[PDB]
């Protein structure tokens, strides 16, 4: 079955350059129309670039002369070489298989986030949100992890190394006055399990290479 795996995103200084890769499975990149599409955070979809099979390339007016779309047939991979990056270029970038006929984007990569900023990378502080009587609702209790003061987006949180998936709320991040992000991940469990079961949140923040596992227990 078809896949598109994207890599290359992350934090990059203004005026710098970054390359995105997109590795296709289950179809030939060489004989297919191919596209990059981006989405600024909380905004709409914006077309970046198309490469025709047979190698014609077309670019959005905001990227023309700065960005190059290419492919490596051997690796079945699509590339977007980006240059002279600006805050405006901050977005999740998507590769998508075009149709070449009805011009439709029928298959998409998972996306990768490109943050254009001069601000420094900072790893998250991870504090527990301890379950108590102020967290219990009859046979049911909530506990969590405050993931504070980090840059840039995103963080991934899991509970018991992906073993606890039921009743998890991981909140969108907020931008503090300090220019750093903060978020909480809470989970509601049965209250009768509070003394027999161990609860660990698994915070991961890839741009700073931090990996914090934190134990949450009653107080």
């Amino acid at each position: 079955e078809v896949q598109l795996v994207e890599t290359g995103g992350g934090l990059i200084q203004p005026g710098g350059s970054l390359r995105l890769s997109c590795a296709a499975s289950g179809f030939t990149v060489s004989s297919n129309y191919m596209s990059w599409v981006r989405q600024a955070p909380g905004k709409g979809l914006e077309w970046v670039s198309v490469i025709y099979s047979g190698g014609s390339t077309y670019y959005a007016d905001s990227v023309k002369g700065r960005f190059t779309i290419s492919r490596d047939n051997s690796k079945n991979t699509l590339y977007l070489q980006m240059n002279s990056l600006r805050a405006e270029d901050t977005a999740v970038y998507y590769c998508a298989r075009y149709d070449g006929i009805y011009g439709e984007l029928d298959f998409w990569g998972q996306g990768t986030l490109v943050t254009v900023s001069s601000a420094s990378t900072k790893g998250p502080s991870v504090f527990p949100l301890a379950p108590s009587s102020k967290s219990t609702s009859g046979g049911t209790a909530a506990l969590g992890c405050l993931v504070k003061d980090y840059f840039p987006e995103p963080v991934t949180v899991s509970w018991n190394s992906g073993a606890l998936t039921s009743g998890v709320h991981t909140f969108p991040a907020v931008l503090q006055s300090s220019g750093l992000y903060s978020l909480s991940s809470v989970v509601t469990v049965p209250s009768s399990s509070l003394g027999t079961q161990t609860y660990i949140c698994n915070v991961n923040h890839k741009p700073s290479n931090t990996k914090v596992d934190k134990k949450v227990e009653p107080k």
Binding site: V37, D106, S137, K148
Partner: protein
């Protein structure tokens, strides 16, 4: 250079409702018009290609209609998982343009929040800042008032709110409010209260603890 205008830009409808979204092109584009469903933090999924043709494995409740300048996407019978932003996109001519999107929200019956409160951990007070967390669990609608009180003193401009995306089975939201105070301000007060006003509550509900 061909502009796509969608209406409405925001829609709120219940399970079982027929949902109808409009997309208008600034100039004729035949049948080169596609529709995408994007759940947030995910790639747009193609729903309809060539105005009226369903994509592979897209439920028959989705369907498209039109040719020229006026197009409609229809969800014949809305389902809880169908909350997303829906885009139309013309492929008649370069550059590919998208419409601005229609955000579809699922209307459900009222559901009051469960209110929980978390005192700042000991470990955090090590580094000289205190974060107090109020949680409003599984409620509808989205709008809630969360007032923080410290020894009865109403707080202003030192709390931030975040709201989860809609639960895909029951359509409710959760909300966290975080109060940030310095360790100095935290240790010089006793009663920390979260007060919650919501449509599903007959009267405001207050959760608090003592330091």
């Amino acid at each position: 250079d061909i502009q796509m205008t969608q209406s409405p830009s925001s829609l709120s409808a219940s399970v079982g409702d027929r949902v109808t979204i409009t997309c208008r092109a600034s100039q004729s584009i035949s049948s080169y018009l596609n529709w995408y469903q994007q759940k947030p933090g995910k790639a747009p999924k193609l729903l309809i290609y060539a105005a009226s043709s369903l994509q592979s494995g897209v439920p028959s409740r989705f369907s498209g209609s039109g040719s020229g300048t006026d197009f409609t996407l229809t969800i014949s019978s809305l389902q809880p998982e169908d909350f997303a932003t829906y885009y139309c996109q013309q492929s008649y001519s370069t550059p590919l343009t998208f419409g601005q999107g229609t955000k579809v929200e699922i209307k459900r019956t009222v559901a009051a929040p469960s209110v929980f409160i978390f005192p700042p951990s000991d470990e955090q007070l090590k580094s000289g800042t205190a974060s107090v967390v109020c949680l409003l669990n599984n409620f509808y609608p989205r709008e809630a008032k969360v007032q923080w009180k410290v020894d009865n003193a109403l707080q202003s401009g030192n709390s931030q709110e975040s709201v989860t995306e809609q639960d895909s089975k029951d359509s409710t939201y959760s909300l966290s409010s975080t109060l940030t105070l310095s360790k100095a301000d935290y240790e010089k007060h006793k009663v920390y209260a979260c007060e919650v006003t919501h449509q599903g509550l007959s009267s405001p509900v207050t959760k608090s603890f003592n330091r």
